[PDB]
């Protein structure tokens, strides 16, 4: 009867779980992206409306019976973005508790099931977020696909295209990415990449998918692809170092986990990142996420209920 909503506005999808107050997940719903930095406000509003309404339709209950809603989404970086997202949910007619956080905060909650720890995201975007034993939080990275997202899938896809073009026009080292990217995208020639990137409405998720090609080429022995993966791991490590030092956790026991289909999928990248952490922070323990981010959002919403 009573339920909560938890929404993960990740870089790959929007993922909503509806749960009872004793954490029995009743249903989940998937829609497209919800980042106001890469879609119009009307586009995002529509996504969240369609997402919530499809779940309520399966649930058979109205929104005003919902005890709390938590949404962690990419693009919720500033207090001003928090209130914009809150407004698109209130516009549905909800007057209960709404908690809007960055997608890294719900990944922390789902991954560690506590408030204290470190989370690195590398999916279509990248970010590090942490909270120390004193309850103080900090973040690094997360500045988006133009002025940030170092070590994200989007960043690896752009760098893969750049390395393939430099291989083609003779400014860089030869790499099998030169032909492999064209095969993957079903393009005849490198000039076709101009239509693909600038003319066709390409999405961040589409560019980030080229991380699959880099991983494949690394397995085939390609040195350029291997160095792209290594440098992304270093960028991700730098974001942890930044948060660890800001929160004065350099020499404290810390639990760290990771989210996103780039850091969690590519063995070499994950290994290099773990190596950097192990070199620098003896007391950081690395674990896998206990639940997913949408269940983290359920934890944050339900924890606000009596
Ligand atoms: C769009 C922006 O400025 N920053 C987002 C950030 O909110 C998010 O935490 C991160 C990982 O999903 O992706 C970045 O692109």
UniProtKB/Swiss-Prot annotation:
Domain of life: Bacteria
A Pfam family it matches: BcrAD_BadFG
Family annotation (PANTHER family): N-ACETYL-D-GLUCOSAMINE KINASE
Family in the record: Belongs to the eukaryotic-type N-acetylglucosamine kinase family.
Species of origin: Clostridium acetobutylicum (strain ATCC 824 / DSM 792 / JCM 1419 / IAM 19013 / LMG 5710 / NBRC 13948 / NRRL B-527 / VKM B-1787 / 2291 / W)
Pathway this chain belongs to: Cell wall biogenesis; peptidoglycan recycling
Gene label: murK
A Gene Ontology BP annotation from the UniProt entry: carbohydrate phosphorylation
Gene3D superfamilies for the chain: 3.30.420.40
Binding site for ATP: 12, 124, 208
Function of the molecule: Catalyzes the ATP-dependent phosphorylation of both cell wall (peptidoglycan) amino sugars, N-acetylmuramic acid (MurNAc) and N-acetylglucosamine (GlcNAc), at the 6-hydroxyl group. Neither the non-N-acetylated forms of the cell wall sugars, i.e., glucosamine and/or muramic acid, nor epimeric hexoses or 1,6-anhydro-MurNAc are substrates for the enzyme. May have a role in the rescue of the murein sugars GlcNAc and MurNAc released from muropeptides during cell wall turnover in C.acetobutylicum.
Alphabetically ordered keywords of this record: ATP-binding, Cytoplasm, Kinase, Nucleotide-binding, Transferase
Major location (coarse): cytoplasm
GO CC annotations, alphabetized: cytoplasm
Cofactors required: Mg(2+)
UniProt-recorded Gene Ontology molecular function terms: ATP binding; carbohydrate kinase activity; N-acetylglucosamine kinase activity
EC number: 2.7.1.-, 2.7.1.59
Protein known as: N-acetylmuramic acid/N-acetylglucosamine kinase
Compartments in which it is found: Cytoplasm
């Amino acid at each position: 009867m009573k339920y909560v909503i938890g929404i993960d506005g990740g870089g790959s999808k929007t993922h909503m779980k509806i749960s009872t107050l004793d954490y029995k997940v009743l249903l989940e719903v998937f829609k497209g992206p919800s980042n106001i930095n890469s879609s119009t406000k009307e586009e995002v509003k529509r996504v969240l409306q369609e997402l919530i309404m499809e779940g309520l339709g399966k649930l058979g209950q109205s929104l005003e019976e919902c005890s709390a809603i938590c949404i962690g989404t990419a693009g919720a970086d500033r207090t001003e973005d928090k209130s914009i997202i809150e407004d698109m949910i209130r516009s549905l007619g909800y007057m209960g508790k709404i908690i809007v956080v960055n997608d890294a905060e719900i990944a922390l909650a789902g991954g560690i099931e506590k408030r204290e720890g470190i989370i690195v995201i590398s999916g279509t975007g990248s970010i590090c977020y942490g909270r120390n034993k004193e309850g103080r939080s900090a973040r690094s990275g997360g500045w988006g696909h133009i002025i940030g997202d170092e070590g994200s899938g989007y960043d690896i896809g752009i760098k893969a295209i750049k390395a393939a073009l430099k291989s083609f026009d003779k400014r860089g080292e030869k790499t099998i990415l030169e032909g492999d990217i064209l095969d993957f995208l079903k393009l005849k020639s490198h000039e076709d990449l101009i239509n693909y990137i600038y003319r066709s409405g390409v999405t961040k998720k589409e560019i980030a998918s080229l991380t699959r090609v880099v991983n494949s080429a690394y397995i085939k022995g390609d040195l350029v692809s291997k160095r792209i993966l290594k440098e992304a791991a270093r960028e991700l490590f730098l974001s942890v170092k930044a948060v660890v030092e800001v929160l004065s956790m350099q020499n404290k026991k810390v639990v760290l986990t990771t989210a996103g289909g780039v850091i969690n999928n590519i063995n070499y990248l994950y290994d290099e990142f773990r190596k950097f952490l192990n070199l620098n922070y003896p007391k950081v323990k690395i674990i896998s996420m206990k639940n997913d981010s949408a269940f983290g959002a359920v934890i944050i919403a339900r924890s606000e209920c009596d």
